[PDB]
Amino acid sequence: CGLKGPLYFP
Amino acid sequence: LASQCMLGVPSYRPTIVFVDIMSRLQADEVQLHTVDLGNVHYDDNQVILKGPKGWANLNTKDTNVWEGDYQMVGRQGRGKADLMKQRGENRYTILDNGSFTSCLPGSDTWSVVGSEIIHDREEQVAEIWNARFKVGPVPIFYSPYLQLPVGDKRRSGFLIPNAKYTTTNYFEFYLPYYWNIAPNMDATITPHYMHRRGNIMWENEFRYLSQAGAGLMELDYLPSDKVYEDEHPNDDSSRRWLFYWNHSGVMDQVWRFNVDYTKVSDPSYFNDFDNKYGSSTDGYATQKFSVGYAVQNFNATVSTKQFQVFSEQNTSSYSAEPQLDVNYYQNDVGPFDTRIYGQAVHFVNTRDDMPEATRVHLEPTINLPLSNNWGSINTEAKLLATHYQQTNLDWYNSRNTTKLDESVNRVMPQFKVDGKMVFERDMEMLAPGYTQTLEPRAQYLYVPYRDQSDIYNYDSSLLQSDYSGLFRDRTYGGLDRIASANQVTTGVTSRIYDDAAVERFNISVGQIYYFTESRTGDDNITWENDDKTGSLVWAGDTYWRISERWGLRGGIQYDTRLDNVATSNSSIEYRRDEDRLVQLNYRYASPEYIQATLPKYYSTAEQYKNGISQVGAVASWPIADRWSIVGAYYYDTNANKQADSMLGVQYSSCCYAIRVGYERKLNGWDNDKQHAVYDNAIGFNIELRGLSSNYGLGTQEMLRSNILPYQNTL
Amino acid sequence: CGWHLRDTTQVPSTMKVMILDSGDPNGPLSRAVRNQLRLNGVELLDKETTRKDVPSLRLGKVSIAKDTASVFRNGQTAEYQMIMTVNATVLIPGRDIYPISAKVFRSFFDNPQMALAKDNEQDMIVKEMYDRAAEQLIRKLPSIRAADIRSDE
């Protein structure tokens, strides 16, 4: 199973 | 609920054949050499372990516990194993023939069991070999591998699926796969099975973050469609698709990038498929791109504006291909302030035989603001200089007596004076220290007549005259129509302020008095009355912040040329939490206003002809601590028929949540019977809890699911 | 009568010199707020100034949403409602922050056979919403001075 969340700058 | 969940979770403190040893260990007996009995209890930063027998190495902090049970510390999980192990300096907690759940003690709603389970605390994952997933005592599912994310770190793999039953597609199933591409970009690929169509739509989402801004793309594709292939048997194939792109951002504080793009395979797409971006409520898909440069005194923007129109009733649509907008500003030019607006645009049509044009517009403005404590006066002057070259005129000039001209110049001086006062009064009638404010405005506007009937209308819709609208310098939204003006707008606002100087209430009333007919030369307007001068337009507005939880709004527009209230709206809201609210709202738009402002066939087609008289009620409320009920109802009072109804129930627990949503909406018209068509949808969502930071009660998501979605009016 | 002309300025005497801060200093809310502050006779210092005694207004998140507010009897949009929300804060030297917000509602009828014209009408409306947001933020400054004085008392 996966987990989605917010994007952020590396 | 988050407190009721953490009440079931252990919390972490800041030596010794033998018992209490320090990580901490306790037992009835310990043999020390490594250590080896009875009432073995172990506790640390992230776990409790308990069992009959244990072992540990004091140099490596390696550990074994047999036949034991465990709990997580400061995090919700628990379970048992036949052999429980700690490895890799407490990175790994490993479970032979083990089990796991996020459920609180003794409340076994669901668990995972496996031949081996590894919790890894650096990677935020539980990995399971020969996984069996159980609800109560019953194994629902099995796989050779499983992984659960036991934290907040993003991970590739399948998400929990969801289902619905719709009158449009029958049974529907969604199985999302999520791809963690990078910190700043990701994808989701979701097969969407539909039972009536007998084939899977592939829904592809891509998201990104960049120096140029953030954006989302969606591509939904269905290779063939057994429903559409029976209604449209003439085409090459029954392919159904949607492409969507949204982008927004400002780069280096000066470069502005925006995209707002939708394209669909056919007019029917959003009536068939309930979708994340479009709606069955929409008559076209918008297709826009823009690039801007902006600084403190200047900006320039290049854009294209294209629209895909779904209705067969007229197939002509205009595009801007491209448009260029330019603004320059210069303050303190002696006593004056200055601005220049410039525009250049090319207009293109979807039909081969409609007119096409290039337009250039230039608009230098000079103004003189003068201001006191109690009032201000502002004077503006402009030129409205515009040039057209028009092309492809043969077809239009063959059908019409008034003819389009290949070249047009329009030059107009605009003059405006805008004057405002403020008066204050002490109140004793409401409460001590309350203050009333009273604010009259008057504006005079002059624009001379120019006959514009040799210019085709590519971009100018008639604007709507709300209370702020009373003070515009324009009757139309574009530059193809600019009406003459010779008018005084007058209006008054009153405000009430409390003893803490917060605005509790306001009301505004005003009117436009016309000294001469406001004309374009291509007016053609189907009003109820031949009235052309005097106090023709009225508008009013009010807001009461009755308390920190109660709020009331209302607006009214009356037009003497319609002999009726043109449009009106009001709403009252109580809101206490995100989860507790009640809103009543009403919207009105008269049959006369539809006849005046919209396409000529709306006055004749029964689905448009009667205007709007819509009552809406919306509520959200928690029942006990663990149920959320959400609902909305909308009613056409002229039809005595429902517009929209929604009902969402979520049961929310520490271990899981379940949501059931219902919607029944208007979704088209039957031309063979002259009645509305309705779609029903029942949706089922299920969610594991206590594994990640989410304890939300689901209300605000349900409140925006329907075709007439909630807006907070406090 | 009982009424009189307004004595005090719309902006507090303690805020007539202030710093304006934004993550988007060249944007349409920043331009509306510059214009509304300057029309009230405020002088605005740069974010990098040597001054430490002056208050500062920071412009935070702006959101705009466009929703179907009414439908025709076939379920198509009659009216869109647009809502603009602005969060901002006023920071007073030696004292706490005072968060403030503006909220604006406008609505318009849709027209599919004049879609380009309706998109230009929407750009026209959103430009006016930024001016009403800037007015609402200014009309809240007297409440911040009242809360500042109350905190000192």
Author numbering:
A (entry chain C): 20 to 29
B (entry chain A): 27 to 38, 40 to 41, 53 to 54, 68 to 69, 73 to 76, 80 to 90, 103 to 105, 107 to 784
C (entry chain B): 19 to 171
Paper excerpt:
Lipopolysaccharide (LPS) assembly at the surfaces-exposed leaflet of the bacterial outer membrane (OM) is mediated by the OM LPS translocon. An essential transmembrane β-barrel protein, LptD, and a cognate lipoprotein, LptE, translocate LPS selectively into the OM external leaflet via a poorly understood mechanism. Whereas LptY binds and stabilizes the periplasmic LptD β-taco domain that functions as LPS receptor, LptM intercalates the lateral gate of the β-barrel domain, promoting its opening and access by LPS.
This interaction between LptD and LptM remains largely unchanged in the absence of LptY. In both LptDEM and LptDEMY structures, we resolved portions of the LptM lipid tails in positions proximal to the external surface of the LptD lateral gate. Notably, one of the acyl tails intercalates between the outward-facing side chains of β1 and β26. Similarly, the holo-complex and the LptDEM complex showed an RMSD lower than 0.1 Å for the membrane-embedded portion of the translocon and an RMSD ranging from 0.1 to 0.8 Å for the β-taco domain. Henceforth we will name these distinct LptD conformations “contracted” state, as observed in the structure of LptDEY, and “extended” state, as observed in LptDEMY and LptDEM structures.
